[model samples]
Target: SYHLDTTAPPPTNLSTLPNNTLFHLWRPRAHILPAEGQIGDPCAHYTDPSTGLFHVGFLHDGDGIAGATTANLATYTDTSDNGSFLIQPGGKNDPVAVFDGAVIPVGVNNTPTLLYTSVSFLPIHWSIPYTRGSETQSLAVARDGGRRFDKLDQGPVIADHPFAVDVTAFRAPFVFRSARLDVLLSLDEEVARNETAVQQAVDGWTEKNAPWYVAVSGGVHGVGPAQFLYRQNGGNASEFQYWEYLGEWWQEATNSSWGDEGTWAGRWGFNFETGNVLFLTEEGHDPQTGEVFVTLGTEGSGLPIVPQVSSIHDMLWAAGEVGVGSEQEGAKVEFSPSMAGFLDWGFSAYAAAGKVLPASSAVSKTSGVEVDRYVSFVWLTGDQYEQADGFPTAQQGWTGSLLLPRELKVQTVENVVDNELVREEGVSWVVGESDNQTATLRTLGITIARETKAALLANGSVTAEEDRTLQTAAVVPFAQSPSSKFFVLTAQLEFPASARSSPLQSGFEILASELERTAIYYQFSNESLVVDRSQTSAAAPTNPGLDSFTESGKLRLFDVIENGQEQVETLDLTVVVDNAVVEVYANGRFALSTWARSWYDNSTQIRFFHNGEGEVQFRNVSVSEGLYNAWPER
Candidate 1:
């Protein structure tokens, strides 16, 4: 029986497994996970006004949408007591499964509501029919302060596909408010070429002051992936029963012109899921004037056909503007993209959920000015193991984890006179109005959450510290005990100009033992950060498929002019290891998350090396062990 009971149950005991167990050796200590079952997409995130705590909803295995409340990112308290699930399957005439969606903080009758997808059947096999009528958008309302929810008597609000469209896939409902129609109405004659069409659409929205909009993920079979658009029927703020279908908000052909740009922005897949829209503002800009970005998980084998990349899914985003069309075009709204790119270059990160952090919790160390910013929580999928044997930890009951929360911001890059730099870097940028003196590049910034860092440091102790200028290699010993499976390693390396241009590699070897080790280093020739896991485990399964062993991300280490002399760039690296999961961050810009399926459980040594002719200087090299577990015994 795929559908489960929705009634609240007593909290399950969440005790940590013993150190000798295989599952315990791979379980993460700091990452978010459930007590027993695995977790999927991160669904809803918002700050509750009453308690000021952050509420997060996620897909708890195929059971339903479960929730947790956190005062800080480091710790969480499950909201299961309110009900085992805020919204679950098996309601009267409900679909067999409840999938990804967003939580509206307020909805009809001043209650917290959920805009979700109800799937009629589990489409686990290729033969399972997943056409138009297979999925539909439904609504659920919470009468108790955002803790639990019940389905509305009206059922699915957007129940059918629009006229004359064959949708191959449909799910992930994202709701937002935009003044794009108003902007189109006020555009100059040169910009608004079809003035009469814009006027007609503007009049309709203006008459009722429609403030709500939605973008549902879908694909039109032979066409490509798209986000279907909708608008609130009237001016009513609490209207959840009716939504007027606008049209395809944004769509692109599979392997089109955009695919030629390579994997930096990622190629458009056959279908899309988990679509989201966030308004981002640059430094010193008004919150209301933020740029709009559309993000979604692309599902299909990408172009250029690299086996490693094509096999995995990608999270892609584009900075664009919304426009309203004429009445002849069904008064539809459309998105015109200016720039776009992948949110993460890793293999595991996908199915992301994003929301604007509350004003109080939006502060981040990466941003120079305090502007309205948003954060995204991504599902770090378990793609390493073959489906036949299940995830590496399936026997122990749970699998999967979430990546470190990333704060999305628009970084102002100065001295940009043209688009060449932006295009080469594959970052979305907005140029200055007066002159091309500056370009604000929108990218996701990586930083360990402050609270999580504090907790790790407080619970762990430094095991190694060193400063050395190495010409070849040096091994830094990391003392570990049975209780110490989590570690944090940080280092700073400065390579000379000549070495920076050479084809040499400089970085560290972690989780090292006699026969198994994972390498994380910078390849100077390509100017990229690489993580190699080919030698991670000897017992890695080859039954169904093998995991991609090496992953690299482009990282340009630009030279800095010091006293009129150009010098090589300094690389700052932070690596966190929680059992099998290893996350690497470089200069707070590039991040690579990978799994190390080491057969040897006692591989905790660290080593640094520089194969270049010139000596590379290393400073502030430190290692800390024993990260505090996020899910302590309860």
Candidate 2:
């Protein structure tokens, strides 16, 4: 039965299976689906010339090319024996297998031509489909809307090399038409073979098969219109190749040759919609400083992106952003200057201030009649930079991976902004930051706190003399000390049932000594988190002005009450202390960041105190290590 309890292990009787089948399929891993066999380097969206149906392809079984086609290529629905529609693979087009090679199709003169890489021998072979409907036993060929194909042959489009033994090879293929000229261009791969060779390794060969980008340009019928190596690697090092594949002979080109690393690309995209061919390349390493750098080149508008990242997280972020920007929103409709600015600002701040602050978010919009808003947040941990003290190039310790809300809770405002920044005033960029920001920070900044604990209001009380001097009814002392200068204090604040107190009752104090301290206090009367440093130090404000805040000397970290009782009953308070800086987050809704010039020593402690005569319960209090990047200098 097509619907049955598909037995992976054999049962004695077929009746042992259920009549209805419930299938649960997991791929090689997440981020990968049906195109199985641990296949990667996904190839997507090729329009068949005859059918006009959209098709998809991917590297299957590792290097085995897999392709499929669909009439409506954007949506599909499926269900197994699950009886429930919940498990249906919705939002994906129905796919039917077309070929079995890593392939890309080029449409020319009402015909779908394919170029693919297939491994018939030890070193994988590059090949293409010459005839349309050759259904042979040996080679796989396609007919009828690219929904089928035959096995591959050792086609004429193989990677060219000189006197090849057994060596590794290259595969990815790309084809595009020239915009200015009526010519077709092809970029495929080959074993990065050099003109000159040195000795092998201890065993047999030197670098057997390194990857290289080989370019071929021609008009109409064939692979070798005008072919040359775009980039190549020699036996011991990389170099530029000047040879062109002239039909039967390999002749040197007009350009000169070189023995240094040149520009190289794995894959590139041509935005035919915009007439821009965008390619990102790894040019070369910094010879003196030994640093790797990358460059992104664009032909049309010449827009730019952050070409290189110091850490792998930023690299991963860029990859995800590049891969995403579709679905509920489709396509990276535009380049993000906000993201570029953040990267540039981060680098400048790190180079100048020698400190890594939390990167901000940039709100941007799509261009069209039906425009949409998108917020880009950059999590740039200044851990790995040339200016930074060198440790591991990546962070294994607790890190601050947070996305601050851009236009959190955006309402109509008087200030207008647009691309023209003049007509577009009322619009803002807050699509639900409360949901995204708090959840992300809590999930990512998990191990930042080294020591955490909860305390009762009674057990954490300090001496009455100290409480009277500090203007508090009760005091809660921190029993455990933190290893780093960064620490966090979080607790649930329960104000009295009847409010009859000053606006500065319950608070957290970062005490360097007795007289010198930074206090982030909660006011029961005002329902605000006040960052009060006036009493922390009895000194005058010399060179102090608000940077990203409004208050002159102190800061109030609370939402402005616009309408009826938008406030909550209980306040969940979180205070982060990093040396001279302190940030307060109230109920995970708003944050107040300020710096205080207090006395510094090794014996500073994070303590909780209440200055109110009325009782205020401090429950579920936790103290932990904050985001402390271990700089080698420190």
Candidate 3:
């Protein structure tokens, strides 16, 4: 499963993907975004343009959507009992710890409702369900002795119901509605278990018997799983009898990886839809029982493919399905992998359906089934490091394409010298420098093999090589460059397929490992360190440490931590992708233990140029006498 090869995206009209599609169109939040005077609500509605309005506060172990409570929210540190509360879809201000109540979800839930708090210990200080766009919004408050109106049905309070009583008597009570009547509700535990409690919560008759529905996300705090009970039909819940459970309340599964802590802190679920049943999930999951349905993450035909996105693939406990067989033991409770949102790396999750994309809502599909709703990523966005210590200020010499996932497979055209990334150009080394007219070429990109040195050899960049002697590893002798003017830089490494295997594969291992072992090379250098910036003006950025390292200097890695920080004078990085593996190297060192994966297995050709920048002036350079001797096993 980990060794799948991914192919590059072919040329297509990217415009074909609609902006309104539900595809995840977003940039990964880099560890942090500044307070810019005052912090904007850490909600998606406030940051990303594609989605920001639908907000469901899921206290996944204590980390809300904007980020976790421990994520430097100005003055608080997720220490309050209120750290586990959530506001439906509404948001206001550049709220740091405040919860809003008017944010109506786009379209997903449509029915009267039943509402309950967390199951066990996760208690909510307050709960008031508000219905937007009504003649008059009526909210059912969860305060003790708080019932001002009339109760429709009668029953005793159970474990997970919301009772409109006093602080001491407030237990989670179930409520329901009926389509035949003007209004109705239930607030009894036994009646709810027997399916009659919904009618009890709406027993009272009045001109203003407003209907309500709730989405129980897998009890976000330690409360247990989320439940969305409702008032359907008229005032009776007969039109819709049961509550739906869509798990992931706050964000994605990635939330578990960030700093948010606690058993109840990072768990969630929301939105359960149906003609009495529907299941929403974290990925594009299809029912194992059904024949024709939809799958989320993958790309293919007629399939309701969620939009293609980059980086974020977080998952949450999704809502489940309920129907005829539900009452038969575990028959009604099987979870389908419908949450296609969790099919990426570790950055995306939580399409809290009941809270956001509600019924009759017009979610403009942006890409393949891409929906526009409340979306949040579970990845850390270095925002806390605004004042983080030691950061590097170095120049980024390489600007390349974003690396694709490892599971993709790109099929080549297999044409006549027409299928390479860059065609093979002549190789030349820097000349007339170092006061010597001749020098040794220490690096090359491809390789070739021959039975004898007298035989003509073929490989990557070079068309052919004569008298090629295997000295070092895979290095082979090729044609020399045509010398040019003063201090010109026409230096590029060229080699045929390795007389052996290509070291390019080994290089890719070097790159992925850098994130955990040598993150200094991949992360932003945002710490204070002693340095010299004579070449350029790049400094440690508060976030991503500044992706564009326009400045040059002697940057230090782990500059913030003094005792363990190490300094490197000049760092060089090289990355290559072949058909099988992706290769990466740092400071000419293979960061990984071994290298054998590359886009090119047998042959590789590369052409570097000063073409656009400037022509190269062949300096003192020559083919290394032992390029082939250094890597016999690669």
Candidate 4:
């Protein structure tokens, strides 16, 4: 057994740390990071009606939950004290640690509440039996907005696994109002008016009305990963004490062909974490017409392994439909997925948590359009830094960071020919294929949060702008006034059809220097976008686990227009750099996030290159520098 070192104090404040430190020199300045110590798995995301501010809680120091509040979603204020975290482990019928959970805007007398996972045992080693009932779903209430919280006297809401099946893992409780419940009620009322149909549907009517739904993540011992569902006792917010089990909502199958024969969705791992759902609908449409999107973290699912890291995880999502079914057992809810894919194609981003933005904050400044959309933040896992042979930041203090907030919107294209499928990296679904006339193509569009874009524009100034046609390469030197380490670069490139047929590699080389550089470019042979980091660092560890690798995604860049007129497409690319971290977005539909600890100081230059002999038109190339520090007081 292991023991805790209670006498050791936490690391010094990160704000005061010198800029020359190894990891500190590359620490992200605009991302959401703790003042000190390590953080993982963002949770408790809720918009407070009392203050109209967004509050999020995350795992702090591996044991407790800390709170952060933001008005613009760009900068945040540490609302909880480090010494006394927002929600600690010890409480009424306490547990050893508090894991990921969700927050309710109003619960039990109109107070903000938290439903978190409580782990009873300490030192959860690999040898420990996982089927034991050690993790429980517990509750806590915060009377003062969301800054302070206290455990409820009622204890764990759903104490043990309701079913007899042995669960290997159970955590991450996600709560939401079920839109299907309302659809069911409407159907019931319509049946009541028709006397003949009322008798036929009486047996199917749900007597126990449940308004709130919850999904807990776990996996069966002998089977595979699954999401267990539960419903509140009544259709009331104040009576939030009891919940009834609704059986397995979704189960991962090894032989299923739904997710591209398990290549895109099922059986990627033995267990799942942070299983959450969003009911998506058009801005002016009814809730019944919305689609259900489920997001989760797949543990032990890492593929194309990264060198030096023992294990890697992934964040995957699926878009589908939800309905209530009447069976011999009783009424149960089920999710029928139409399509699924990865949320991020890179190795670092995982365990995503989502929250719907308020209408006032959801409007797009560029398009002047609004829709029913939500935002997600994922934990940028720090295994690359923690396991590196030379990087000692995990021992020096902090080790993890959160990806920039991403806004998710559903786009629907009507009247598409059947079987003319177009699948991309983000979530997508094809409906009405059976009609034979036409089908509706629905896809999820992801981009950086609007508020974050506003922040970057307000804090940074344009350092470079150019429009030119290049057959070889062009170099743009960094400006000396603002810190070049933190900047945003955007470009539009028009590749002619002749260039597409040629064998060449075209894209940008960022953080480039004479000795070390990272490349983000498009491969014409493979028809994919890639981020090559093999030479990111010279002094970093060299091992099978720590070896740098390239991250890439297959993309269809050309569009066919009227009269078979094949026209070249303009590739819109945006890259954000924060010291060691880098995020790349292609046409606002595909995203790749990765990190590297470069040893050279001159790795701040940018280069645009095309190896093809054909000329490529590079237009509207711009770079913005001088990003504001999210934590100015540090």
Best by TM-score: 4
Query: How many Å off is the CA of 29 in candidate 4?
Result: 1.1
Ranking by TM-score: 4, 1, 2, 3
The positional error of residue 404 in candidate 1, measured at the CA in angstroms, is 1.7
Per residue, candidate 4 scores C-alpha lDDT tens digits across 1-634 of 1221212321233223343243465678888878877788888888776676778777877877788887777778888566236787876544678888898776766677888888786543212346465788888887665887788887799888756777756788998765465444345544434435533543443423436678898777667778888877644545677887877878765223344434444334656679878766644212334467888877563556443232646677777865555434543656777777667767777888888666543133233435535778878866552554443554336677888888765655445444433433322455534356545556556688877877877757786656777776554343332335788888887787777667767777777777677888877676678888887765443433333778776554644332444445577888888777788887766677888655456667777777646667778888888667776555
lDDT of 2: 0.28
Between candidates 2 and 4, name the one with more favorable lDDT: 4
Rank by lDDT, descending? 4, 1, 2, 3
Tens digits of lDDT, candidate 2, 1-634: 4342222322233223443221121000101123111223233234444444445443333323344433321121111111101101111110122222222232222234444333333311112222221111012234445544433333324333322211112222232211111100111112111111211111222222322223221111222211112322321113222222212111112111111221111111110000111121111111111111111111011124222221211110011011112233322111221011011112111110000001110111111112111111122222222223331112112111221211111122111111221122211111112332121111001011111112111123221212222334665566654543455566776554454345546666664455555566666554445665664432223212211122111112222122443222456666555444444555423444444434234326667777655556666777655442321111
- Rate residue 388 of model 2 by lDDT: 35
Top model number, lDDT? 4
Summarize candidate 1's per-residue lDDT along 1-634 as a digit string, tens digits: 1221112221121122222233454678778767656678888776564555667778887688888777766677777663346788886425688888776665766556788887775552211235545667888876575678788887588887677687756777877765454446346534665646654544444423435677888777677778887766653445777887777878888544243565456667767778888766553212245566777877666345543233547777777766655445454556888767666667777888877656554232222224444667778776432232333353345667787666665544334334444446434444444244333444544456556667777767786556877775554444332224588888888888787557778788777767667888888777778888887764454412225458777665655444555566578888888877778877655677877766455566677766645567888888878877686533
Candidate number that wins on lDDT, 1 or 2: 1
Per-prediction CA RMSD (Å): 7.3, 24.5, 24.2, 7.0
**Which pairs of residues clash in candidate 4, taking residues 3 or more apart in a chain or in different chains?**
15-634, 307-544, 307-545, 307-546, 308-544, 308-545, 308-546
Worst 10 residues of 1 by lDDT: 1-10
TM-score of candidate 1 on Cα atoms, chains taken together: 0.82
lDDT of each: 0.65, 0.28, 0.20, 0.67
**Deviating ranges (above 4 Å) for candidate 3:** 1-97, 100-213, 216-320, 323-344, 347-380, 384-634
